[PDB]
Structures are given as C-alpha cells and as structure tokens.
Design a protein around this ligand. Structure first.
Ligand SMILES: [Cl-]
Length: 299
C-alpha cells in the first residue's frame, strides 16, 4: 500500500505501564508498536528502530499517568481499515480514537489541558474533619480549593514545582490559563472530584506539585501564605501528589483539530480511565497512603 505520514489521537489508562516512551514495565509505545507491526502498518525493522518511521509523540507521560488525548505521528503503509486493524491488536485500555493522513511536512504540543481525579479526603482538614472515605466535601472547602488553585493562574516563577538531580534552577517562569476543581461525585460511598488545569510548557512534576501544595494547605499542614512564598527565591519542599490521578486531556497545536472525535474521547475517559483510577483508590488506597507522608515536609 502507499506510504504516508499519519497522526493518531490515542487514549490509554496508564496503570501497568512505565509511561508513554521508553527511557521495568512496558510502555504505551510498546503496545502501539506491536500493534503496528502485527497489523502490517510498519515493517518489523521500523518497530525495532522507531526513528525509521519518523515516530513522534506530543507528550512523554510519566509512569502511571493516563491520557484521553495523546497525539503521535509516524509514517506507515496506509492499509485498508487501518484504524480498526491497529485497535484489534491493542488491549481494551489503549484505543486509537482518531487517525488522519497529513503532509510529509507535518512536523507543537506544549499547550495542554490535564485533569487530576482524586478522592475528596485529600481536602479533609487533618484536625477538624473525618479522614476516612465517609468524608464529604463542603461547599466551603471547595471554595477554598478553588481560591488557591486560582492563585496559580497567570505567569509565575514555578522553580519550586519541578524536580531534578542538579541544584534548583532559580528561574522557571511558566504560564497557567486556568485551574479549578469540579463539584464532587460519589461511586459506592467513595467521593471524588476532578481538578482541571490548562497551561503551557509544563515541567516535570509541576502539576503533581501544584496539586500537592494545595492539598497540604487545605488539609492544614501549611499556611495559605506558602503558596505566594513558593514563588519566591527560597527553596520550598513542595509535596508531589501521585501520578495515578493525572490524565493528559488535550494537546493544543498544517493545522490539526480533533473536534469530531470529542464524543469518543469522553466515552473512553468515562469507561476506561476514570474506573481504573477509582478502582485503584478503592482497593489499593494510593491517595490515603500518600497523604500519610505529609508530616515529613517542613513548612
Ligand atoms: Cl506526565
């Protein structure tokens, strides 16, 4: 068949993988590459050396992180029923949701939306509220969450909201368009809520730390003043919420728009992404265990 550049819109539940791209567990790309080879889209040696098919990914999602709207591009043999055939070789929790052929000169993924799905007891005041799963989020606690998240909006020095081996880079200005928390919902006694953040050029661990600091403040481990203070020059030990709850929702970019795929994106998030996170919180208590680490931070 004819060789063409294509762009795929893909989604995955991230549990059980070591991330999108190989740097332990297989990666999302291992599953996609195997499906590409099995279906004959690409020859075996392009699976062995992915550079040979000009494979590119928009977002290098970390261990355990999910995605409703990852985007990749590569060159394939454009076989009949290509989309169905690739999906037929993937587990149910990884899906190609859209597939378009583009010009060989289709090279843009820094502008992004993520959500973070977490048990609401992440917001329970350590002293004043019950800490178990009967906790219910008050209108007032949610106000507070939203007020603090709103503080992130705009442009700030986020040097305390990343990590690294070397010393801390004293300047890491970044832009946040929006950040808020939705009203909670309950599944079998367990209450959750979805935080959404839209921004640009997110750094490693930045969203997890942004969520982690607001959890620490709201639960009562740190004063609200730490948020403004963390913009300052001084190092602050910012708590890093787990990767489990994080979902890459959208990459915002020859132009490219996935509007007709929004229904499938939504459905896959509801059917595959959210249930795995909720299931893991219910059965493995990831959040509850992480919250118990908060006292080690010196505020
Ligand atoms: Cl990530």
């Amino acid at each position: 068949p004819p060789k063409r550049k294509i762009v795929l819109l893909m989604a995955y539940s991230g549990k059980g993988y070591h991330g999108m791209q190989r740097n332990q567990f297989k990666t999302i790309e291992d599953d996609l590459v195997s499906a590409l080879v099995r279906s004959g889209c690409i020859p075996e040696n392009h699976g062995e050396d992915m550079r040979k098919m000009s494979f590119q990914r928009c977002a290098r999602t970390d261990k355990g992180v999910s995605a409703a709207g990852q985007v990749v591009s590569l060159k394939v043999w454009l076989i009949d029923d290509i989309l169905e055939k690739i999906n037929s070789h993937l587990p149910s929790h990884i899906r190609i949701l859209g597939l378009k052929r583009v010009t060989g000169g289709f090279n843009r993924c820094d502008a992004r939306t993520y959500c973070y799905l977490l048990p609401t007891f992440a917001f329970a005041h350590k002293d004043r509220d019950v800490q178990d799963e009967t906790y219910r989020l008050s209108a007032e606690t949610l106000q507070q969450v939203n007020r603090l998240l709103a503080c992130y909006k705009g442009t700030h020095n986020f040097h305390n909201f990343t990590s690294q081996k070397g010393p801390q880079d004293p300047s890491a200005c970044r832009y946040i368009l929006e950040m808020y928390c939705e009203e909670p919902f309950v599944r079998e006694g367990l209450e959750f809520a979805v935080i959404r953040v839209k921004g640009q050029s997110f750094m490693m661990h930045q969203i997890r730390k942004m969520v982690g600091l607001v959890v620490a403040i709201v639960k009562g481990y740190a004063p609200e003043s730490v948020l403004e203070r963390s913009w300052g020059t001084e190092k602050v030990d910012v708590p890093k919420a787990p990767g489990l709850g994080l979902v890459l929702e959208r990459v915002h970019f020859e132009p490219l728009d996935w509007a007709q795929e929004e229904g499938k994106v939504a459905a896959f998030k509801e059917e595959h992404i959210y249930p795995t996170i909720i299931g893991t919180e219910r059965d493995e208590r990831s959040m509850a265990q992480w919250l118990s680490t908060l006292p080690i931070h010196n505020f």
